[PDB]
Amino acid sequence: VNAVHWFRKGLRLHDNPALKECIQGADTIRCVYILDSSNVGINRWRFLLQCLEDLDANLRKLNSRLFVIRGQPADVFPRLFKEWNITKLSIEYDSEPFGKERDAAIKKLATEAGVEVIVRISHTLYDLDKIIELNGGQPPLTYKRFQTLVSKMEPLEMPADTITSDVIGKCMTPLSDDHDEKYGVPSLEELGFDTDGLSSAVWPGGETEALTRLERHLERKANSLLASPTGLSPYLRFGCLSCRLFYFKLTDLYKKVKKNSSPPLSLYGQLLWREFFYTAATNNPRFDKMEGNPICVQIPWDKNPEALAKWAEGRTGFPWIDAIMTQLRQEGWIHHLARHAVACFLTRGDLWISWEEGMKVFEELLLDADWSINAGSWMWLSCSSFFQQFFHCYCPVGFGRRTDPNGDYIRRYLPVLRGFPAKYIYDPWNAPEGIQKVAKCLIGVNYPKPMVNHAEASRLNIERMKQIYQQL
């Protein structure tokens, strides 16, 4: 008997009930990752390749190796079933709409080919469908009802024991030679990416880095918009860190510092908010769209492709919004308050551009932008859905002025404006012609002009949205 575990969104060896279940009594095992879009989306693929090399390095310690394969799963696995005589195929359960129809089609190919399919839940805390049935066959519309539901469920089981020396147990991985250059982990330059000007990784991918950051993150629990060395959101999305392990180590550490066996749901706010959008989208194949979405308000946005280009590329004329997009493009991550700032500038604040357009921009640059979380957030940031209570739009200039008056974050990612003082660093258009020449930066030549007047554009869109909700 042979077996193959398909890796997709669980690039880790800890808490893997799908992988560990497949090696229980199989004679052969092989871990396979199927790797089948633009230029700026390089930090996304660099993160992924770092996780696969880390996943291969941890497999090398067990005298196994990772098998990276190009192509589509509907074409690759049918020939891997016969060339390897595969009997068992284990996968981590994917609740997303595209993932479910992809899994149901692959296992239909496997069941008719004599291959048994093993499915286990590891990317989420609970079984999302069990939460939907408690609500009445429909996922919760609000985060409030969602927290009421997760408290109405039996506690989670301990995460599956990590794959070690005995978990294998006389289970040979048939790593023949010629393995490299065929099943090896490609580089960024092998995918067609230009890495001549690429900087060092700010968010190093991999399972080892995730567990390292998790230990230091919990150690600092018992303002700044820069990247924190204890960030875990990209590793939760790519599956480098399991949410169930994050859950139990958050509980156990909370019981030690305190004496209360009833931790508030604010302790798992990062996981429950993450778990919420997975539940709200598993039964909604149009969750990433406005038209045809049962839980999205229809809004007549303006279609300005050139304005979307200025916003996405970080050339809007507002140093606050431009500094956020330059950090998003270069580092692949921005603060949550920064996400709220640039979303208002594009949706319900200034440009009046559809949230779907901003969803696809974050889809390529934001490292922790999962299909469920990234789609649901843009609906809430644009008041198009009702997941959480709304908030006032952020003025671009007068927002980060009190986070740091010098504009240290502005001069950080916008070196073209490094010669402006605090009275004009946030409003360079209101700067006199003399001070523009002494800084070697003229507005409209070296730095873009304000693509819109915030005073008129704000009151324009506020009245438009008043007309929308008063009509609803």
């Binding site: 879009s37 633009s38 230029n39 700026v40 989306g41 009445g136 429909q138 519309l141 609000t142 409030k144 009802r145 067609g192 990416f193 045809g292 049962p294 839980i295 999205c296 308000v297 229809q298 809004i299 007549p300 300005n304 492709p305 050139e306 304005a307 979307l308 280009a309 200025k310 590329e313 050339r315 004329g317 440009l351 357009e357 696809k360 921009v361 008041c383 009702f386 959480q388 209570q389 709304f390 908030f391 006032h392 739009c393 409209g444 030549v445 873009p448 002009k449 304000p450 693509m451 008129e456 554009a457 324009l460 506020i462 438009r464 949205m465 008043k466 007309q467 929308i468 909700y469 009509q471």
Partner: protein
């Protein structure tokens, strides 16, 4: 081997292909001033077609929203839009 065009190319992002960021647009472009009553009246017509495409909820889904959104409890406008 005999694959004809083999030098693969990574194309630009979607927003750069659909649009055309002029090197002047990246500096000079500014959104035009709009007439308030004109843009509002045009949105009334487009909102008329987008009327039965609006989200329709059931009994439990409405009370589920009232515990979060006060404008669902009062019938007015949200606290963020009302400015």
């Amino acid at each position: 081997e005999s694959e004809h065009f083999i030098k693969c190319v990574l194309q630009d992002p979607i927003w750069l292909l659909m649009a055309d960021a002029d090197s002047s647009v990246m500096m000079t472009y500014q959104l035009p001033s709009r007439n308030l009553e004109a843009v509002l009246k045009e949105d009334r017509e487009k909102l008329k077609l987008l009327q039965k495409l609006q989200p329709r909820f059931t009994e439990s889904q409405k009370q589920e929203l009232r515990e979060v959104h006060q404008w669902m409890q009062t019938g007015g406008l949200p606290a963020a839009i009302d400015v």
